[PDB]
Structure formats: C-alpha cells, structure tokens
Design a protein around this ligand. Structure first.
Ligand SMILES: Cc1ncc(COP(=O)(O)O)c(CN)c1O
Ligand SMILES: Nc1ccccc1C(=O)C[C@H](N)C(=O)O
Ligand SMILES: Nc1ccccc1C(=O)C[C@H](N)C(=O)O
Lengths: 410, 410
C-alpha cells in the first residue's frame, strides 16, 4: 500500500455493512432515496440509450449539451455569464468534484479548515493530499423556548478567525449541511468570506443539497459574495438534483484559473464521464429550466414534497421522546437520543454512545439510522455521540412502516 | 496549482480537439467507434433506466451483479476462481483503473518502467504519484519478406533487464498494444515475468483490447504465468468489450492484498460508479458468457468483423504508398509515411514530423489520423516521428469515404 493512503483504509460506510442487511427492518440510514425519480429523467436515459453516439465518448470535461445547460441555470443563479468550457467541470459525482478540487489545489503541509460534524470524506481527501485538516465545531445557542432547529447551531467568528494562519489553503463549507441540515445565513457566510479575502485562501463549497430549502430559509452561495468568485469552487450533483443518486454526476463551477487545475486532475485520472447519463441529464435540466416559476419544476416541487416528510418525522420522533432538531434543508434529521431510557451494558465496547444506540435500535426496534459521531473528528465525538441521524427522502409506504415502529415503541 | 500536477496540464487529446472539428472530414484518428454497439447492450440500459433502484447508489467497488458476472467470465479465462468482492474493483474506465493502481501502489521516488510507444496517460499518471518513469523502446526486427506486422516489433531482453534496479516499484504492460497493435508472445511475457519475480516488483497490465486478436495470434495473460498472480493487476474495459466507449466502466483483476489498496483509493476519490450502466453491463456479460463457444458471442464476432476491416485498411494505405504495419490485435493501424516526402516544408513550427504530416493531410486530403509521437517521451520522438496511426472500428459507409479520399489522392 502506498504511503499517501496509509491509515485511510477504514471508510465509515464500508463499516455499515453491519445490520442493514436484514430484510425485516425499515432503513432510515443511508441517503438512499426510494421515491421514483421524475419519470422524464428515466425517459431521457432510455432515449439516450438508443442513439449510437450517445454511447461513445464525449468532451472530457463535460458533455457539450450538459455544460451548456449548467451554464444556463447557474448563470441565472449567479447573475453572471458562465463559460461552459472554462468555468465548469463535470466529475463522477460530487465526490469526484471534491477530490478534483483537493488534489488540484492543495499540497503537502497546507492546512484545510473543516467544520464538524462534516460529511466524512472531507478528512481523508484532505489527508490523502498531505494536508492538515483543521477542525472547528458547530455550537448550540439558546433555542426560542419553542422547538429545536438547525438555525440554533452556528460558529464563533473569533474561533474561526483563529484557525486561519498563513498555512491555510482552503476552508470546506457544506450548506445545506449534512448531517444537521443547517442552511448558512448571509451573515455566517460573510464571516467566511471576510477571512478568505483577508488570508487569500480558497473556499470549496459543497452545495449538493442546494434546492432542498424549507420555508423561512434561502440557499445563498458564497461564490456570489463580494470578492468570492475568484477563490471559490462550488459543487453540485445530479444525485441530489434529480433523485437519481446512482448516476454519480456532479460539477464544479468556478473561475478559470481554478477550474483548469481541476481539469488537469481529471484528464490524469478518469478523464471522461458517461455520455448516455450526461445526454439524458441535460434534457432533464432543460425541461425543468423552462418552468422555474412553476410549481411542477422539480426544483420547486421536491422541497415542497420533502417538507411534509420532514414534518412527519419531527412528530414521529417527538411521539416517542427522541428530541428532534428540525432541519432548515436537505433530507436528513438528527435527533437527540439521550433523554431516552436505556440499557447499553449489553455492549461494553466503548466505541461511541450513538453507535451503541444505533445497534440497539436495529436489534430491538427493527429500525436503523446513522450515529452522528461518524462525522466527527476523534476529539469532537464526545460532544455529538448522543446524536443520531435519520433520512426522510422516502416513499409513504416506507414512512408508514416507520410510523408503525414508532407507534409501537412503548 | 498543486505541485503534484506540475506540467501535467498539456494532454495530447486536448491538443487534437481542433483538428477534425470540420464536418466534411473523415476522422480516422480518435478511438471513437461508429459502428453500432450490440442491440442487447442498448436495450438493457433502457430496461435498467425504468427500474427505480438501479437509478440509486449501488456498491462502491462494483455492482454485485456485474462483479458476479466478471468473476464468472474471468474465472473461465484464468482457469481459477476469482473473488467477486476482494479480487475485483470496478472503476471509471480503464483510465480510472490505471489511476487506482498507481495511486494505491506507487510512491514518490519509485521507478516505473514503460515501453515506448505507450498509451499516453501512463507517463503523467506515474509522474503525479511522484514516481520516475523509466523508458525503453520497442525495436523492429527484419520482416518475413512479404509483410510488415506488429510481430516484427519486439523488445531487447538484456536492454529491458538493465532497466530494473532496486528502485523499480513496477512495470506497465499494454497488450494488445496501442498504438502498434502488438500481441505479446508467451516468451516476451516470460521475460517480463522472470524479471518481476527476480526484483520483487509489480506488473500492471492494460488488456482492454483482450478480445481483439486476429488469426494466428492469442491473447496470453501475464497474470497467469508462474509467480505472477501475487504481483499483477490486470485491467479491462467496458468501452472495448462492448463497443460502448461512452459508458466509461473498467475493472482491475488481481490478488486480494494488492486489490485492497486500489479500493482504498477509490473510496476516497469518487467512490461509486453509476448503477444503471453496471446493471446493464452485468446483463450483457450474461448474454455473452452463456454463449462463449459460438460465432455469435460478441467476444467472437467483433474480432471476426474487424479482421476484415483491418485488411481493407492495409490495402488502402498501400494504395497511396503508405507503408502499413499490420497489427496482431487492437483496432489501430500504424503506417510509415516517410516515403512520400510530403509538402511540408513550410509549416515552420518545432513540432515532430508526424504532427505536421497529419495537419497537412487534414487540410489537403480531408482525412485525420494520430501521430505516433504522441505516444512517445522526448528522447524517443525522433525514432518514431515518421509513423502515423489510423483507427478502423468504423462502419462500411465510413471506410467508403476514406476509400474515395485515397482513390483521388494522385
Ligand atoms: C454533503 C455531501 N457532499 C457530497 C456528497 C457526494 O455524493 P455524490 O458524489 O454521489 O454526488 C454527498 C452524499 N450524499 C453529500 O451528502
Ligand atoms: N456514504 C456512501 C458510501 C458509499 C455509497 C453511498 C454512500 C451514501 O449514499 C452516503 C449517503 N448520502 C449519506 O450521507 O448517508
Ligand atoms: N484519448 C481520449 C481522450 C479523451 C476522450 C476520449 C479519448 C479516446 O477515446 C482515446 C482513443 N481510444 C485513443 O486511444 O485513440
């Protein structure tokens, strides 16, 4: 094994080849949706399948229809003209966009700043490229007495200021957040922008959940803020946008002197992405782009159809004494697990408290979920190990199955 | 730009983008098939698309059905059991497979041996991993007298020997060869094998064209010689097997302890590959695994087809005075052009001869092709710059248009 991958062989999700295998259990664990995709999405794949060229190679950096379209949608969003060939790069999912960014822009010895809990791949990527990850936790604030929400989490500008030294290359930001479903505010985002201009650092912005915003909140992109355009890579995904997680396409949007670097990583790695997938995706995009103002547009329709599902979950968890944190965005929900009962000597491993709960709730309650501690640096886990993550981009069928379990908990 | 990607930004395939952007030219350059893929392969992708599940995440190291299919197929060819899960890794084409291997096994300062001409991604992949490529030319011997063939290109055993030192981490083998089209013999692979076991080094073997061997020749697989299972990673590709280059799926077969390192890379880069494509390929592989013994199996009829088309091409090139090397395998043909004294004098660049020739041939003759010096390191260009590579994975109609071009050449 090569030095650069030393001690990167434990992956957290490989490890969840633990009980989810069961049949008789409802799985609210992985971000694996079971709603049907928008039927036209499935259409276009078929249609793409039958055209010979759409089965042979395409522009290495993105199928020309697909990039033209990304161009169109996103420059509506940025209020700017976005070059399809120079400011976009299509990669194998958001994962492969994250990886093109880190490998392309970050050396041995740099520090990359990461907010905990983090989507878990941010750490090993940054460690694969020889950098030192630097951690800052999100912290609770007094709620409004009434309920618990993602907005009651936030970060201390003076702590953040202090992680920036002359060794910081980049800060990874992910909004809407996974796992808490925080939507960063214009003010929170402005602190991060201030610091990157001041230290001249990159921001890499994981926005795969961008359309998933609920009432009372707005996805805002840091790349839009004064002075960010030319120091930011913003990442999207087809998986999130069209409930087609199995296609594994996303895109980095950004200025040319940064994008060309990611293009270099790509041509030296995977080069080209699948054509039938990108042909079909472009079409799926155009269909929705021509109806943005309309409640049919998958952009407007899916968060509206997801908010109800979010609420069913808050209830199902209040109903059994799990304290839910209600998410501004994305399709996850964390619940505080700690003011429930039980027993957890059965185990007497001292792997974290939530892993123990999750196994207990799998065996005893026929329900799985993800321990929030998986997404936490070692240092940080004690402070999040009573938190457990649940996923709700599920079909009614499945949320009934779930509601039975809950109904029947006590 | 990160140091790991210093001067890895130029890429030949980029450079060649402006060549036949012209609608009225007949492109025999890119390895872009324009025959039809098998009907079944297109149908299965359609089928796939209308099933919900196979538009979501599947197993990271490969779709269970696909790897089951590959373990079956390749167990047949290696005459041994291949582990579905530990002995196979599915990745974005053979590029990504190559990239997994070098990323996972090759450290900075290590030497990797590469035979010239080489597939051009080899060099840059190995430099990015901080490794030093150590180059050695394929040299010609005399012709039988009637025919110039790939088989008249070989390497010098003692020259090769002297390339392995206590710093050789690996050798890269490409058979069938791109661009010569050479099918290595049991003897030639016996010499490379002898050396790897003497120096305790690895062998990465690019064998995507495994099925395209023509009469009189046989794909032999180095990984099957004594001593080499332990130490070889053998790659293979969906674009080449099913003429579906736009799918960009490949595999690397090899031992569990070498193989695990390739998955540490993948899980930390892009992770999954697309589901519907693997779903569909799985199924195509079943249709042809269960008929291996027939003329109608795609593994059989595709070479049978192209043997015809190749032979058509030896003839056209001989027509206009071009000296073809008739390939044992693959679907490229290399022709010598020096005996034309083309009227380049007055492109005045510092380009090698063959870039100038292809430029000239494009403007004047209306036909593109690829210079072989694109498959050569600096020191080797001059011993290869009179050669030019043409592709014949084309349909009749296309070969026709090429036929007119040659017939009006003088
Ligand atoms: C924050 C975040 N970033 C990136 C990804 C990458 O997913 P994909 O590569 O399949 O687009 C995910 C997985 N859901 C995610 O939740
Ligand atoms: N983590 C993975 C590893 C391999 C294959 C898929 C996934 C996922 O889908 C993660 C999911 N989006 C999650 O955050 O729960
Ligand atoms: N080289 C590429 C770069 C980008 C996109 C496709 C290709 C190819 O298809 C290569 C072709 N098979 C070749 O060897 O000529």
């Amino acid at each position: 094994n090569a030095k650069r991958i030393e001690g990167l062989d434990s992956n957290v999700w490989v490890e969840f080849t633990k009980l989810a295998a069961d049949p008789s259990v409802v799985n609210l664990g992985q971000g694996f949706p079971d709603i049907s995709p928008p039927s036209y999405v499935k259409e276009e794949l078929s249609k793409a399948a039958f055209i010979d060229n759409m089965n042979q190679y395409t522009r290495g950096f993105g199928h020309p229809a697909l990039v033209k379209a990304l161009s169109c949608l996103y420059g509506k969003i940025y209020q700017r003209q976005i070059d399809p060939n120079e400011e976009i790069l299509v990669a194998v999912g958001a994962y492969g966009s994250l990886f093109n960014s880190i490998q392309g822009l970050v050396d041995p010895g740099d520090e990359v700043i990461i907010m905990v809990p983090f989507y878990d791949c941010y750490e090993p990527m940054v460690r694969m490229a020889g950098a030192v990850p630097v951690f800052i936790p999100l912290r609770s604030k007094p709620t409004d007495g009434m309920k618990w929400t993602s907005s009651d989490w936030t970060f201390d500008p003076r702590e953040l200021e202090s992680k920036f030294s002359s060794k910081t290359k980049a800060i990874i930001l992910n909004t809407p957040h996974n796992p808490l479903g925080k939507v960063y505010t214009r003010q929170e985002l402005q602190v991060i922008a201030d610091l990157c201009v001041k230290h001249d650092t990159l921001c890499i912005s994981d926005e795969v959940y961008e359309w998933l915003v609920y009432t009372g909140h707005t996805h805002v992109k840091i790349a839009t803020l004064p002075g960010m355009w030319e120091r930011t890579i913003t990442i999207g995904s087809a998986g999130k946008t069209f409930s087609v997680t199995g296609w594994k396409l996303g895109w980095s949007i950004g200025p040319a002197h940064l994008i060309k670097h990611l293009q270099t990583v790509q041509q030296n790695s995977f080069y080209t992405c699948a054509t039938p997938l990108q042909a079909a995706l472009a079409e799926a995009f155009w269909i929705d782009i021509k109806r943005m103002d309309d409640p049919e547009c998958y952009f407007n329709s899916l968060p509206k159809e997801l908010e109800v599902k979010r609420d069913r979950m808050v209830r199902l968890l209040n109903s059994v004494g799990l304290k839910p944190i209600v998410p501004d965005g994305g399709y996850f929900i964390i619940a505080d697990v700690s003011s429930l009962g039980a027993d957890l000597s059965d185990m007497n491993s001292d792997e974290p408290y939530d892993y123990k709960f999750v196994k207990w709730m799998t065996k005893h309650k026929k329900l799985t979920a993800i321990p929030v501690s998986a997404f936490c640096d070692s240092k940080s886990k004690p402070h999040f190990e009573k938190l457990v993550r649940f996923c709700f981009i599920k079909k009614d069928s499945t949320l009934d199955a779930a509601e039975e379990i809950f109904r029947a908990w006590n």
